Amino acid sequence: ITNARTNNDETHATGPIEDLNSTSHGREPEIESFADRAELAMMIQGMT
């Protein structure tokens, strides 16, 4: 067993998928989303 106080990346789970149920691969990217920012701060305005 070894440790790592690391939270800025993964760099610890690597490998090739071998089946749509494979559970030990690397990491693939995700949908490129956007800002969608709406805070909750006592009379914020529209920005529609």
């Binding site: 909750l40 701060a41 006592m42 009379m43 914020i44």
Partner: protein, 48 residues
């Protein structure tokens, strides 16, 4: 708006609004309570 005071937060509001939106009393303006404009005698022994 998101936050909402759950109890009363206006004990230090003597007067709200000196306007005249229709050249009369604004229908939600607040003059002070008659309790805070009392001038009674003092017992001549200990102020009070």
């Amino acid at each position: 708006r998101t936050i909402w005071n759950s109890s009363i937060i206006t004990q230090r509001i003597s007067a709200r609004g000196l306007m005249n939106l229709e050249d009369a009393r604004p229908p939600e303006a607040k003059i002070s309570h008659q309790s805070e404009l009392d001038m009674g005698k003092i017992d001549e022994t200990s102020g009070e």
